[PDB]
Write a protein that holds these residues in place. Structure first.
Motif, PDB file in Angstrom:
ATOM      1  N   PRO A  95     -46.568  59.558 -33.930  1.00 51.51           N
ATOM      2  CA  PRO A  95     -47.231  60.733 -34.500  1.00 51.51           C
ATOM      3  C   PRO A  95     -46.271  61.856 -34.818  1.00 51.51           C
ATOM      4  O   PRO A  95     -46.555  62.662 -35.712  1.00 51.51           O
ATOM      5  N   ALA A  96     -45.137  61.929 -34.122  1.00 47.43           N
ATOM      6  CA  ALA A  96     -44.116  62.898 -34.485  1.00 47.43           C
ATOM      7  C   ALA A  96     -43.676  62.730 -35.928  1.00 47.43           C
ATOM      8  O   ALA A  96     -43.195  63.694 -36.533  1.00 47.43           O
ATOM      9  N   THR A  97     -43.833  61.529 -36.485  1.00 48.62           N
ATOM     10  CA  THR A  97     -43.587  61.278 -37.895  1.00 48.62           C
ATOM     11  C   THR A  97     -44.793  60.644 -38.577  1.00 48.62           C
ATOM     12  O   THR A  97     -44.728  60.350 -39.776  1.00 48.62           O
ATOM     13  N   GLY A  98     -45.884  60.422 -37.848  1.00 53.05           N
ATOM     14  CA  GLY A  98     -47.057  59.797 -38.421  1.00 53.05           C
ATOM     15  C   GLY A  98     -46.766  58.405 -38.936  1.00 53.05           C
ATOM     16  O   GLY A  98     -47.524  57.867 -39.748  1.00 53.05           O
ATOM     17  N   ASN A  99     -45.671  57.805 -38.469  1.00 51.30           N
ATOM     18  CA  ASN A  99     -45.279  56.474 -38.925  1.00 51.30           C
ATOM     19  C   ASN A  99     -46.197  55.439 -38.293  1.00 51.30           C
ATOM     20  O   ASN A  99     -45.930  54.872 -37.230  1.00 51.30           O
ATOM     21  N   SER A 100     -47.313  55.203 -38.974  1.00 49.33           N
ATOM     22  CA  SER A 100     -48.104  54.011 -38.732  1.00 49.33           C
ATOM     23  C   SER A 100     -47.178  52.804 -38.678  1.00 49.33           C
ATOM     24  O   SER A 100     -46.468  52.513 -39.645  1.00 49.33           O
ATOM     25  N   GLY A 101     -47.149  52.118 -37.543  1.00 53.33           N
ATOM     26  CA  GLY A 101     -46.323  50.942 -37.386  1.00 53.33           C
ATOM     27  C   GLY A 101     -45.056  51.133 -36.585  1.00 53.33           C
ATOM     28  O   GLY A 101     -44.062  50.454 -36.873  1.00 53.33           O
ATOM     29  N   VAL A 102     -45.047  52.032 -35.608  1.00 50.25           N
ATOM     30  CA  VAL A 102     -43.893  52.194 -34.730  1.00 50.25           C
ATOM     31  C   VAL A 102     -44.161  51.479 -33.414  1.00 50.25           C
ATOM     32  O   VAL A 102     -45.247  51.591 -32.833  1.00 50.25           O
ATOM     33  N   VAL A 103     -43.159  50.742 -32.937  1.00 47.20           N
ATOM     34  CA  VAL A 103     -43.279  49.939 -31.724  1.00 47.20           C
ATOM     35  C   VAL A 103     -43.711  50.821 -30.561  1.00 47.20           C
ATOM     36  O   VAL A 103     -43.414  52.019 -30.529  1.00 47.20           O
ATOM     37  N   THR A 104     -44.413  50.228 -29.600  1.00 47.02           N
ATOM     38  CA  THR A 104     -44.775  50.884 -28.353  1.00 47.02           C
ATOM     39  C   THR A 104     -44.065  50.177 -27.206  1.00 47.02           C
ATOM     40  O   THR A 104     -44.210  48.962 -27.039  1.00 47.02           O
ATOM     41  N   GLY A 105     -43.309  50.935 -26.416  1.00 48.45           N
ATOM     42  CA  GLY A 105     -42.511  50.331 -25.366  1.00 48.45           C
ATOM     43  C   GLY A 105     -43.374  49.643 -24.325  1.00 48.45           C
ATOM     44  O   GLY A 105     -44.491  50.056 -24.036  1.00 48.45           O
ATOM     45  N   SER A 106     -42.834  48.574 -23.741  1.00 47.71           N
ATOM     46  CA  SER A 106     -43.632  47.771 -22.819  1.00 47.71           C
ATOM     47  C   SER A 106     -44.117  48.606 -21.640  1.00 47.71           C
ATOM     48  O   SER A 106     -45.317  48.642 -21.346  1.00 47.71           O
ATOM     49  N   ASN A 107     -43.203  49.310 -20.969  1.00 45.29           N
ATOM     50  CA  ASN A 107     -43.585  50.068 -19.780  1.00 45.29           C
ATOM     51  C   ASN A 107     -44.713  51.043 -20.075  1.00 45.29           C
ATOM     52  O   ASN A 107     -45.636  51.202 -19.267  1.00 45.29           O
ATOM     53  N   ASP A 108     -44.666  51.698 -21.231  1.00 42.23           N
ATOM     54  CA  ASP A 108     -45.486  52.880 -21.438  1.00 42.23           C
ATOM     55  C   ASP A 108     -46.862  52.581 -22.014  1.00 42.23           C
ATOM     56  O   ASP A 108     -47.718  53.469 -22.012  1.00 42.23           O
ATOM     57  N   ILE A 109     -47.105  51.358 -22.490  1.00 42.41           N
ATOM     58  CA  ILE A 109     -48.402  51.036 -23.074  1.00 42.41           C
ATOM     59  C   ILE A 109     -49.514  51.410 -22.109  1.00 42.41           C
ATOM     60  O   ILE A 109     -49.496  51.030 -20.933  1.00 42.41           O
ATOM     61  N   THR A 110     -50.492  52.159 -22.610  1.00 37.80           N
ATOM     62  CA  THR A 110     -51.663  52.520 -21.830  1.00 37.80           C
ATOM     63  C   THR A 110     -52.690  51.404 -21.845  1.00 37.80           C
ATOM     64  O   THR A 110     -52.704  50.547 -22.733  1.00 37.80           O
ATOM     65  N   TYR A 111     -53.564  51.435 -20.844  1.00 33.92           N
ATOM     66  CA  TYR A 111     -54.637  50.457 -20.775  1.00 33.92           C
ATOM     67  C   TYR A 111     -55.686  50.736 -21.840  1.00 33.92           C
ATOM     68  O   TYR A 111     -56.451  49.840 -22.215  1.00 33.92           O
ATOM     69  N   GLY A 112     -55.728  51.971 -22.344  1.00 38.04           N
ATOM     70  CA  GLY A 112     -56.664  52.296 -23.405  1.00 38.04           C
ATOM     71  C   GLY A 112     -56.370  51.538 -24.682  1.00 38.04           C
ATOM     72  O   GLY A 112     -57.285  51.048 -25.349  1.00 38.04           O
TER      73      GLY A 112
END
Lengths: 50, 50
Positions: free
Chosen positions: B3-20
Motif C-alpha cells: 500500500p505504500a506504493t499501492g502495488n497490487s501484487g507485492v509478496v507477503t513475507g512468510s513470518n508476517d502473514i496474518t490469519y485474516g
C-alpha cells in the motif's frame, strides 16, 4: 487501499467499506466534502492539535 | 498490494502473514476460487492488474 484493521489484507479497508467525495470551484472559490459509509456504517474523526 | 506504493501484487513475507488473509483463502476456495494458471512473483512482483 490497505487494512486500516491491519490484517495485512489490503482488501478490508476504509475505502473498501465507505464512500467519500470532495468538490471545489474557484469561480466561487469554495469547497465541500460529502461522505457516507456503506451498508449501514458510520464514520468518526479524532483530532489532536489541528 | 504494497500500500505504500499501492502495488497490487507485492509478496507477503512468510513470518508476517496474518490469519485474516488466510480467511480469504478459506473463503476463496470455499467459493471454489482456484488460480486458472500458476502465477509467480516476478522478482517478488506480479502486475497490479494480475
Amino acid at each position: 487501499n490497505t487494512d486500516d484493521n491491519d490484517n495485512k489484507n489490503s482488501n478490508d479497508d476504509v475505502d473498501d467499506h465507505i464512500n467519500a467525495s470532495f468538490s471545489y470551484d474557484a469561480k466561487t472559490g469554495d469547497g465541500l466534502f460529502q461522505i457516507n459509509a456503506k451498508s449501514g456504517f458510520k464514520v468518526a474523526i479524532e483530532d489532536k492539535g489541528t | 498490494t504494497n500500500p505504500a506504493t499501492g502495488n497490487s501484487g507485492v509478496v507477503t513475507g512468510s513470518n508476517d502473514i496474518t490469519y485474516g488473509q488466510i480467511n480469504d483463502i478459506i473463503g476463496m476456495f470455499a467459493a471454489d476460487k482456484i488460480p486458472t494458471t500458476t502465477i509467480q512473483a516476478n522478482n517478488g512482483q506480479i502486475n497490479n492488474a494480475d
